[PDB]
Design a binder for this molecule. Sequence first.
Ligand SMILES: CCCCCCCC/C=C\CCCCCCCC(=O)OC[C@H](COP(=O)(O)O[C@@H]1[C@H](O)[C@H](OP(=O)(O)O)[C@@H](O)[C@H](OP(=O)(O)O)[C@H]1O)OC(=O)CCCCCCC/C=C\CCCCCCCC
Ligand SMILES: CCCCCCCC/C=C\CCCCCCCC(=O)OC[C@H](COP(=O)(O)O[C@@H]1[C@H](O)[C@H](OP(=O)(O)O)[C@@H](O)[C@H](OP(=O)(O)O)[C@H]1O)OC(=O)CCCCCCC/C=C\CCCCCCCC
Ligand SMILES: Nc1nc(=O)c2ncn([C@@H]3O[C@@H]4COP(=O)(O)O[C@H]5[C@@H](O)[C@H](n6cnc7c(N)ncnc76)O[C@@H]5COP(=O)(O)O[C@@H]3[C@@H]4O)c2[nH]1
Ligand SMILES: Nc1nc(=O)c2ncn([C@@H]3O[C@@H]4COP(=O)(O)O[C@H]5[C@@H](O)[C@H](n6cnc7c(N)ncnc76)O[C@@H]5COP(=O)(O)O[C@@H]3[C@@H]4O)c2[nH]1
Ligand SMILES: CC(C)CCC[C@@H](C)[C@H]1CC[C@H]2[C@@H]3CC=C4C[C@@H](OC(=O)CCC(=O)O)CC[C@]4(C)[C@H]3CC[C@]12C
Ligand SMILES: CC(C)CCC[C@@H](C)[C@H]1CC[C@H]2[C@@H]3CC=C4C[C@@H](OC(=O)CCC(=O)O)CC[C@]4(C)[C@H]3CC[C@]12C
Ligand SMILES: COc1cc(C(=O)O)ccc1NCc1ccc(C2(C(C)(C)C)OCC(C)(C)CO2)cc1
Ligand SMILES: COc1cc(C(=O)O)ccc1NCc1ccc(C2(C(C)(C)C)OCC(C)(C)CO2)cc1
Lengths: 318, 318, 318, 318
Amino acid sequence: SSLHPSIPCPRGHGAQKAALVLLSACLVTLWGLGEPPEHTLRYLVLHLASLQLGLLLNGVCSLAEELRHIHSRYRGSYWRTVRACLGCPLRRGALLLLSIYFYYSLPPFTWMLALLGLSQALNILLGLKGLAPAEISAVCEKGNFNVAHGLAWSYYIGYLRLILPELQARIRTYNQHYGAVSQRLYILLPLDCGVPDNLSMADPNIRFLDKLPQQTGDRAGIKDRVYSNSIYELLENGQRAGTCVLEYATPLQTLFAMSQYSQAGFSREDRLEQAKLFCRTLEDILADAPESQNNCRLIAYQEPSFSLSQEVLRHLRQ
Amino acid sequence: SSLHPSIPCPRGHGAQKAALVLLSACLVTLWGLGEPPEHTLRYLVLHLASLQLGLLLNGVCSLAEELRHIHSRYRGSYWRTVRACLGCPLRRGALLLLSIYFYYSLPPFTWMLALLGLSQALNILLGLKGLAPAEISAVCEKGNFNVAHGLAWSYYIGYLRLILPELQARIRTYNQHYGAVSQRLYILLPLDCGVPDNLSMADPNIRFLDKLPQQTGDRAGIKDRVYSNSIYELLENGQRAGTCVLEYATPLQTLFAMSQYSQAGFSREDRLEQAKLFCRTLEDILADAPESQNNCRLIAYQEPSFSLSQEVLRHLRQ
Amino acid sequence: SSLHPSIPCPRGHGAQKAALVLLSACLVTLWGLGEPPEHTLRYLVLHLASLQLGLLLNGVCSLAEELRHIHSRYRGSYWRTVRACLGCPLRRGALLLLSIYFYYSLPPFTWMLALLGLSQALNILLGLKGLAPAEISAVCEKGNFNVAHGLAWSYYIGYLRLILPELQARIRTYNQHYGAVSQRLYILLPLDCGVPDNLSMADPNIRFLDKLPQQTGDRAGIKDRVYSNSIYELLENGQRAGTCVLEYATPLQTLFAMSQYSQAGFSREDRLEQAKLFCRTLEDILADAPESQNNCRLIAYQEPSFSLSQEVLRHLRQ
Amino acid sequence: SSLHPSIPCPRGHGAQKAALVLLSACLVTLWGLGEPPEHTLRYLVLHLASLQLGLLLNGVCSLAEELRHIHSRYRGSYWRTVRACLGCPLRRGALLLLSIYFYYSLPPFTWMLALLGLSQALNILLGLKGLAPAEISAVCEKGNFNVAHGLAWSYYIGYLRLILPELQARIRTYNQHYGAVSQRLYILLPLDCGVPDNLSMADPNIRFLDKLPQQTGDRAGIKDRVYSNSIYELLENGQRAGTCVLEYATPLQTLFAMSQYSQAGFSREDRLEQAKLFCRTLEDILADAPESQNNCRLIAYQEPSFSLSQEVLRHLRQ
Ligand SMILES: CCCCCCCC/C=C\CCCCCCCC(=O)OC[C@H](COP(=O)(O)O[C@@H]1[C@H](O)[C@H](OP(=O)(O)O)[C@@H](O)[C@H](OP(=O)(O)O)[C@H]1O)OC(=O)CCCCCCC/C=C\CCCCCCCC
Ligand SMILES: CCCCCCCC/C=C\CCCCCCCC(=O)OC[C@H](COP(=O)(O)O[C@@H]1[C@H](O)[C@H](OP(=O)(O)O)[C@@H](O)[C@H](OP(=O)(O)O)[C@H]1O)OC(=O)CCCCCCC/C=C\CCCCCCCC
Ligand SMILES: Nc1nc(=O)c2ncn([C@@H]3O[C@@H]4COP(=O)(O)O[C@H]5[C@@H](O)[C@H](n6cnc7c(N)ncnc76)O[C@@H]5COP(=O)(O)O[C@@H]3[C@@H]4O)c2[nH]1
Ligand SMILES: Nc1nc(=O)c2ncn([C@@H]3O[C@@H]4COP(=O)(O)O[C@H]5[C@@H](O)[C@H](n6cnc7c(N)ncnc76)O[C@@H]5COP(=O)(O)O[C@@H]3[C@@H]4O)c2[nH]1
Ligand SMILES: CC(C)CCC[C@@H](C)[C@H]1CC[C@H]2[C@@H]3CC=C4C[C@@H](OC(=O)CCC(=O)O)CC[C@]4(C)[C@H]3CC[C@]12C
Ligand SMILES: CC(C)CCC[C@@H](C)[C@H]1CC[C@H]2[C@@H]3CC=C4C[C@@H](OC(=O)CCC(=O)O)CC[C@]4(C)[C@H]3CC[C@]12C
Ligand SMILES: COc1cc(C(=O)O)ccc1NCc1ccc(C2(C(C)(C)C)OCC(C)(C)CO2)cc1
Ligand SMILES: COc1cc(C(=O)O)ccc1NCc1ccc(C2(C(C)(C)C)OCC(C)(C)CO2)cc1
């Protein structure tokens, strides 16, 4: 993650290592207590059986609702709703049968089932089924259940994938008729999601020079949809120090606008997290993208002091 | 919903009602079993205490990993990492104190703790904590952890919010300078996400007529970014029956492309679900949007024969 | 409430009457059970003592926080913080002393205090101190803890109190030089808080004619602050049917804007409730206001079908 | 805070920490009292059951009144009225079922129910359910049930959001057409709410210099509504030391007037608290407002001698 240190790296296997350490410590503790391994095995199996029964009860409770979306969300099939509510029915049934066998056999069952159902219903009604923020974040990053993922893939598929391949040609054509601009598209990634319309307001050293040859193409029923890129001059000590195609990442603006609107259910901490996730996902996409043949550079910064023109000049000279 | 029957409606309280029924049934069962209610209370409290201890152990395991992201996700505060892993530390600490006071004092604590830690470690190591698809979907829709949410908000914020307010003026200008175009933007929402770049390549009856005057505005460091719309003619039995500003929703293309790129981690079924969610979110946004003063229409359709021209004509003649 | 039937009337004494009925029924039930009145009195006094002790504990818990705002919110006085946390200290102390005396005397106390403290701490930590929506609404309306109250009083104090007294003069001056406008200012109160800028868009029968003589006045450091009122023509059957000074209530727009922004913590149901409360409060203000000498009329409507021009014409002719 | 030390900061978790300390102390006390923990659990559960029954009775009493507003506040749905009076009916019903199962079955239910109903009726009839001032303030600030909140959002939405973006242009125009006015709007926030209409009547050193070009725009059915600002000169020891666009915050006047009108139900202490809350809310709004690109300053002051001119000059020379 060379963009900015504030970008979090993907979660690793620290939880599994801590779980292994905990398992070893618990085995050592059980050994020290002197309790026989048979009692430990029996009670552990009973605990796992109770967990499976709770899973079944919660799955039935969730099925009560999911059967209302059977046609809209599950193609009108009960089997798919069951599979979504409680995982694979075969595995769940096997585990439930084993639980019943090893509970009724190993040193009442209807009372235990009633108690577990009462506890599960209490958790459901009191809203105790909530998941911790870290668990939610891990699940979303694993399954890519993030707005930033879609925003990055739309920025690449919709704009970069169609602009980077035909950027050096435009820059050349511009140079032949004029200008000493670089041969890359520079994208600004403010982690604060500011994204002003005119760069001069962000830093008066950014001075617009002129446009590149517009790129026209049919897009989703829009005839001759136009892509335009502006050439900007970076000044140092009052004179010209650079000239480049510079632009802000548009999706970040959307993120900022999603935090303002209440209907979006989007907060400012969520805004920062999703901005950093967008930057990381975009960096990941461009690395394995044949379109980005070194034709683009990403500049991510966290506004503390500094100068945006200085950032661009440092990324240009170096 | 109104866009299409296949659009799922937001989840309700069916699970809570099922939980209440289950709680009543369990209470009746315990009443009929003739067991001491005080024993029932003791064992329910013990079960909840065991759940709290398991939560603590899993939170420690997750903290072992989150502490590696203390400076990138939590701004260097150990309090924030603990809060993310264990929820509100005050509430969890109080629950742990109660669980210890009651388990260590009601009719060995260390052995139970070791067994619970062993079970939690086994669940973590073997990956048994995975949420069911329905639970993940409910969590994502409650917290809006979905790509479609961001895509819809980007479409409204970046395109519609700037186009619709200044749409009637362009239509009037074109009508004075040129046929009888319907004064509304008709947005096509193919749920299959099969968005061709040319409508005439989808259904021959739809034919490109002309283009509205371009709308230019500054956007995120790009000077005079141009938005263009296209007026099409609807050939009913070979004769122009109506004209409208027609276009597909661009974000759906991304959903189709994300389902084609492996690095996106996006499935076809996930693509369809996110398309339906995008349509629902866009409808909700435009319902409360002051910009949509009857300035746009959403046309959601699913191809089972089917003719897009008939859909557009039906939504026009209305 | 002649404005609109949807405007809720102020809460009455239904709760007190229901409480009296409940008290009578409970006395009848106690009489039927045959239990002696002395036991009832003793246990009722003990229950009230427990309630007082819980109040004291919650007050101490709240004091732990309020002492942090002693200087900012309580003028640096501990007595005021105590008075705010637990009401009048004299009454609270007397009730606590009576509780102690009638608990230790009437057929352990430290154990009971420990149990009550545990319960109060559990309620505080688990967030069980929440108040029901109806109770919150009643408390806010009693104490006028509503945004609509302030908005109505600002609309009256800031605009109407300075405009209505000098409205007939402006209308006269306008008529002498021209126009057959009425002699009152008509204010639109959409309960949906739509409030478009141009009335013609709301209903094309509303046609602006010309302005009234602007009213200038120094206001909070603004020299020659200007108040302008627009004259509008109401058409019926294509011809002129009325002419009046017509305008929307500006605060409603703010309410609508408060529901859009997430930082406002304002929902759409809150928007409707506060719009109706604003209308009721404004109606109450004008009735007892010498400034409103029949110089203004309020038109509140709920957009279902109907015509705003028809509403204004009906309020004019009748 | 930064505007003024007297501005209270938002309430934190001090009450929860105090509750946790109290819970620990009560657990230690019960441990030292040598009482059966099972008895402690039984009696705690009984106390919570009694609280739930009291909640049910009070909810019935409040429902008796709310059913009169079923069509004006709850759209004719008895479910909504019940939900408002009793919270989530499913959760409350489950809690009631548990309370009945445990009170009627643990070591007479009807007599306790009658006693609890009698106590609740006595509390309702005698008005003993009044929340303490600190609790009411915390609830109002958590739910933003305050007039100052609406006043601040109206000030930002109606005036600043439309003035600041188009403020530098007017200042530049005046500078070209006329002295060296500071390029920022300086807003005075007198916490005493003593807002005179003329600054020169407050401190002679502040003297009216000129007016900026008027800014006209359509607003809620009013054509060409004009916003005007005034440039003042700051006479330090009789010589112009600085110039700025200065003005009081108009809403504070309303707060002063509301404290003068009896029908407003607004007190002087409430006025001061709401003024401080208004300043805090305005600061928070402008912190995250993209319009405030260093285009305004908030000057909050309290008169203990004191000179406004010195305050303005100090905030200018900075
Ligand atoms: C001495 C001890 C005494 C004990 C005291 C006992 C009684 C005390 C109190 C209260 C009793 C409540 C009476 C209910 C009357 C409603 C009848 C009706 O008629 O209601 C029925 C209603 C049909 O309506 P509907 O057709 O409109 O369906 C709507 C749909 O549900 C919504 O779904 P969702 O809310 O988003 O999940 C959707 O959203 C909405 O649509 P939209 O959003 O557009 O409005 C509509 O479709 O539901 C049902 O049939 C299902 C209910 C049947 C199962 C019951 C749930 C579990 C509860 C209790 C059973 C266990 C027993 C324990 C009871 C605990 C109490 C202590
Ligand atoms: C076999 C059984 C074993 C049992 C297991 C026991 C241990 C298990 C687990 C965890 C132990 C936690 C270690 C805490 C380390 C923090 C030290 C520190 O150093 O923390 C101290 C910290 C000072 O910091 P600070 O100067 O920054 O003050 C901030 C202020 O509080 C914020 O106020 P607020 O949050 O809006 O309320 C404000 O907002 C913020 O400002 P800003 O917002 O700008 O950031 C700052 O001013 O607070 C304090 O001194 C007060 C804390 C002292 C009283 C303790 C609260 C009650 C808790 C426990 C006592 C009962 C015992 C039961 C424990 C239950 C556990 C089972
Ligand atoms: N039908 C249609 N005609 C248009 O002119 C248009 N312009 C934008 N959009 C769509 O609105 C949404 C908002 O775009 P945003 O700028 O926030 O992200 C955009 C933006 O960051 C970038 N991008 C796309 N087109 C341009 C462009 N012409 N110029 C600069 N950047 C662009 O790549 C992202 C995805 O664009 P599309 O995925 O093809 O559809 C967009 C998008 O879904 C349009 N849709
Ligand atoms: N300093 C200053 N100069 C101005 O030109 C100005 N214009 C508005 N405001 C303040 O912004 C806020 C928003 O006003 P809103 O229109 O939403 O409610 C306004 C509006 O409904 C009505 N009103 C006040 N002035 C006018 C006016 N000139 N024209 C029409 N309606 C007006 O009465 C309400 C209270 O106004 P003020 O309480 O005097 O201060 C306002 C207000 O605090 C101004 N403040
Ligand atoms: C863990 C549980 C079982 C017991 C914890 C009890 C206390 C020790 C807690 C309760 C309130 C906590 C405080 C609440 C809020 C803050 C502010 C927080 O802010 C910062 O200074 C850093 C924040 C950041 O960098 O984002 C630092 C931790 C602190 C002092 C916390 C420290 C620990 C406290 C005192
Ligand atoms: C009261 C407690 C103790 C038990 C209640 C259990 C059920 C009978 C509840 C749970 C969910 C409830 C439903 C949830 C939502 C709705 C939608 C609601 O919407 C409307 O049709 C009217 C809404 C309006 O007019 O605003 C009408 C009530 C109803 C059917 C409710 C009826 C009663 C239900 C089934
Ligand atoms: C919203 O409040 C909750 C939040 C959370 C969470 O944050 O996970 C969990 C549970 C919550 N409330 C339900 C509940 C709380 C406490 C108890 C209790 C008693 C106090 C009955 C004596 O039983 C035993 C115990 C040791 C487990 C804890 O104490 C039972 C049930
Ligand atoms: C979100 O959790 C809560 C919500 C609310 C609310 O909304 O009013 C209140 C309480 C909530 N949790 C705390 C809690 C404590 C105890 C019980 C319980 C047992 C489940 C012990 C068996 O004992 C006392 C009881 C019989 C009265 C009900 O059951 C339940 C819950």
